[PDB]
A paper describes a structure:
During energy production in Desulfitobacterium hafniense, MtgA catalyzes the methyl transfer from methylcobalamin (Cbl‐CH3) to THF in the catabolism of glycine betaine (GB). Despite its lack of sequence identity with known structures, we could show that MtgA forms a homodimeric complex of two TIM barrels. The topology of each subunit is characterized by a funnel of eight parallel β‐sheets connected by α‐helices on the outside that form a complex of two perpendicularly oriented TIM barrels. The active‐site cavity is located inside the hydrophilic core of each barrel.
5 of THF and activates it for attack of the incoming Cbl‐bound CH3 group. These first mechanistic insights were confirmed by replacing Asp102 with alanine. In the MtgA D102A mutant, methyl transfer from Cbl‐CH3 to THF is abolished as compared to the wild‐type (WT) enzyme. X‐ray structure analysis of mutant MtgA in complex with THF‐CH3 gave further insights into the reaction trajectory. Therefore, both mutants mimic product formation at a late reaction state.
Numbering used by the authors:
A (entry chain B), B (entry chain A): 3 to 306
Write the structure that this text describes.
């Protein structure tokens, strides 16, 4: 059990946060990522709408089967593409989604094209407020009226968990990412300490623990990149890559994390089955921790 | 982490116990279990020597690849069969092994045949001293001169983790399982709190924590019990069964367990890969906690 009173956010019906076993893990699948084969032009945002709709329908089905809620990670490499990707997600699912790009200019341009829309404000989560934030970026977020953002504490100047906490809460003459988010009008903070590599997923998890111990913000991480760069294990193929993947993705959940960005949506079939199993074992512990489940839509009540 | 100084046993080279991150997880694979297709006659102990050698060679290879040591779980349905099984294991591997059977009189009968052989004393671990131990069982163990035993610290009267203090130490007019084991000349106790089903693996792990926190005995369990009877998952095939299995088998390691009985040895290829991943992430946490690895033969230094 975590020391601080946990913030539980209601993201247009998706509950995220709380004490371990209170709410199922929220699973965040990536679509239109670099090299996604359903995209034929990543600059114009031209993609197979049937194949994309099939992924969204599969996520709904897996979600209904396990009780794990989903938020879609929507990636783009251009303003034009990311704008079209967001319009498509708005119309073809009811789920919340992350507005994501490596390029902050792409994120901000796309956000500008969406204007002030009550549906966007309810469903769109900014991915992310990170070390390179600008006043322009914070202004674009405020003008869009967004209320939830991923706070990403990934930084090669902040390897140790406590240095990632310094990046979040601020230190000396740096306000920190939480303060920057608040100045943008963000009231709800999904804290992602970053995953440098597989082995340091324990440090990511230690940083999630400190966040939930002291602040009570929902904590999660995105270990898909580190897993896919693990040449030695990937070389082995199926099912060796998936079980190792499952070990990495479940580990933060075993230490009380609230959400996982699991990588490409095509991996949802095995990710949902691994994560739902962990959630069901943790919830069964609820009597010993003195926690009450916040919902009957829970893997413990569904997967057996 | 644990307050108690942890007992670390050396079982013919296999180190079992310690603080989390100090030693790799010991992996215990089952052979000659009920339904094992390499057995044609479970009463006479007629089995495929080439297929048994191949499993033991595959355990040695995976062990050398990850740094996870192994103990063999040797199951028999008759005295004649279990005797032959143990003679084969003695000759075809160097690993310690569990002498195991659903039928206590099969364990007792087999022990009589194997005699007070100094190799039996060094490599044979009694599986197990249970709630309903008999004087004839304790006499057989003493006469064989065994030094290590699994203490199955399980009872439907002691479902709560804290009740395992009662089972181990005794209570009221009941001799504890530790006192019983010592009367049989046992000096080294591998504590298994028992696993009823998948979900209750969280209660098993809380019991392991209590045992290590207060007594320092190595703690492990057999999640295999629940997983292969989980038809919903098994019938889905690869990789759904493997990732679900990986979630269950890794969970106790993430809470500080020292050994896992992972079921049939045919599953070693994906069990080693999942468990090595968890061990590597836990040991990486040593860099923050100051906990020193007790061996360079560790997944953290091998799998990347
Ligand atoms: C019950 N159990 C156990 C335990 O709980 N605690 C200790 N110390 N030792 C043991 N030893 C035996 C057992 C762990 N080993 C196992 C557990 C389960 C299986 C198993 O599920 N076999 C399958 C058939 C094999 C298959 O097709 O999977 C079955 O349905 O019976 C095979 C071996």
């Amino acid at each position: 059990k975590f020391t601080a009173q946990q913030h539980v956010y209601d993201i247009n019906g998706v509950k995220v946060g709380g004490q371990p076993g209170e709410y199922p893990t929220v699973l965040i699948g990536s679509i239109f990522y670099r090299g996604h084969k359903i995209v034929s032009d990543g600059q114009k945002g031209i993609f197979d709408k049937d194949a994309a709709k099939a992924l969204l329908d599969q996520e709904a089905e897996l979600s209904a089967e396990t009780g794990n809620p989903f938020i879609i990670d929507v990636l783009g490499e251009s303003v034009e593409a990311l704008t079209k990707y967001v319009e498509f997600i708005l119309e073809n699912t009811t789920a919340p989604f992350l507005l994501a790009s490596i390029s902050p200019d792409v994120r901000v341009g796309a956000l500008k094209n969406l204007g002030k829309d009550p549906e966007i404000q309810k469903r769109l989560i900014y991915n992310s407020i990170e070390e390179h934030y600008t006043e322009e970026e914070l202004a674009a977020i405020k003008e869009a009226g967004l209320k939830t953002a991923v706070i990403l504490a990934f930084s090669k100047k902040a390897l140790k968990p406590n240095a990632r906490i310094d990046l979040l809460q601020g230190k000396d003459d740096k306000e920190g990412l939480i303060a920057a988010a608040k100045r943008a009008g963000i009231e709800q903070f999904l804290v992602d300490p970053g995953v440098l590599d597989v082995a340091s997923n324990s440090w990511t998890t230690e940083a999630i623990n400190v966040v939930k111990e002291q602040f009570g913000y929902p904590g999660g991480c995105a270990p898909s990149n580190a897993v896919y760069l693990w040449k030695k294990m990937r070389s082995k193929g199926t099912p060796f890559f998936e079980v190792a993947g499952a070990a990495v993705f479940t580990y933060p959940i075993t230490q009380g994390a609230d959400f996982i960005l699991y990588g490409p949506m095509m991996n949802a079939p095995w990710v949902y089955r691994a994560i739902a199993t962990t959630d069901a074992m943790i919830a069964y512990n609820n009597k010993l921790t003195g926690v009450k489940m916040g919902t009957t839509e829970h893997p413990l009540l569904k997967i057996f």
